[PDB]
Amino acid sequence: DPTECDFELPDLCGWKPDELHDFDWRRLNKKTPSSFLQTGPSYDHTYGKNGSGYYMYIETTGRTENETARLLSPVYDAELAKNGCFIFYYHMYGRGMGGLRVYQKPDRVPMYQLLSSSKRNNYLLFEQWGDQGNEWYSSASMLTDVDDDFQIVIEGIRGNSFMSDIAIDDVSIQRGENCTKAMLHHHHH
Ligand SMILES: *[C@@H]1O[C@H](CO)[C@@H](O)[C@H](O)[C@H]1NC(C)=O
Ligand SMILES: *[C@@H]1O[C@H](CO)[C@@H](O)[C@H](O)[C@H]1NC(C)=O
Ligand SMILES: [Ca+2]
């Protein structure tokens, strides 16, 4: 089972969309169709500028504000019981940008409770809102021991206009030292 994905292949290292959401994340190469209007990446993080590498993104043209898209990792087996990390890169460029949330879902926990307002703070690894500029940022999140198998859930929320494309790339789970390193140089909480 792969613990990292650069999204270069169409099978996405076993990541799959949520069976009940508003729309799918898309895999794409370079520029988003709405790019000319100051939104979305111009290239992925793996191969960078001039590069032709692939990222995942929400197409926000023709969707409604606060509609959500979810991308789910394969199911992992207590690889969090170490010093577990989730590390990923994201691109949030666009006026009227929506939001990006990253949850850790224990397998037993149904997606309904996971997302509910009542209980989602216990599971949020990452939450960001608004325009962040034309640039790839990164995040590293400590992962809690839930004594269960689990999934990583990346949820994009469309903003108030079609200029709210969000992209992810280069996702990763790591353990131990690699975590303390990551925390030394990745933005974290
Ligand atoms: C959309 O969600 C954000 C935060 O959850 C909230 O501030 C905003 O008012 C919501 N707008 C609508 C129209 O649902
Ligand atoms: C940290 O990363 C290196 C290179 O990928 C690898 O050799 C090492 O096994 C990793 N450490 C742990 C504790 O997984
Ligand atoms: Ca990539």
Numbering used by the authors: 137 to 325
Give the original sentences from the paper that presented this experimental model.
The Scavenger Receptor-C (SR-C) and Fibroblast Growth Factor Receptor (FGFR) of Spodoptera frugiperda (Sf-SR-C and Sf-FGFR) have formerly been identified as the cell receptors of Vip3Aa. In 2018, researchers in China found that the scavenger receptor-C (SR-C) of S. frugiperda (Sf-SR-C) is the cell receptor for Vip3Aa. They showed that Sf-SR-C could mediate the toxicity of Vip3Aa through promoting the internalization of Vip3Aa into S. frugiperda cells (Sf9), and that the complement control protein (CCP) domain and MAM domain of Sf-SR-C (Sf-CCP and Sf-MAM) were directly involved in the interaction with Vip3Aa. The Sf-SR-C and Sf-FGFR are single transmembrane proteins in Sf9 cells.
Using X-ray crystallography, we determined the structure of the Sf-MAM domain at a resolution of 2.25 Å. The space group of the structure was P3221. Only one molecule was present in one asymmetric unit. The overall structure contained ten β-strands, which could be divided into three pairs and five short α-helixes. Although the expression construct of the Sf-MAM domain contained three glycosylation sites (Asn186, Asn202 and Asn314), only two glycan chains that linked to the Asn202 and Asn314 residues were built in the final structure. Two disulfide bonds were formed by Cys141-Cys149 and Cys221-Cys315 near both termini of the protein. A calcium atom was present near the N-terminal of the structure. Structure docking analysis of the Sf-MAM and Vip3Aa C-terminal domain (CTD) excluded the possibility of the two proteins binding. The surface plasmon resonance (SPR) assay further demonstrated that the MAM domain of Sf-SR-C and the ectodomain of Sf-FGFR could not bind to the Vip3Aa protein. As some pathogens can invade host cells by binding to scavenger receptors, our structure of the Sf-SR-C MAM domain may provide some insights into insect–pathogen interactions.
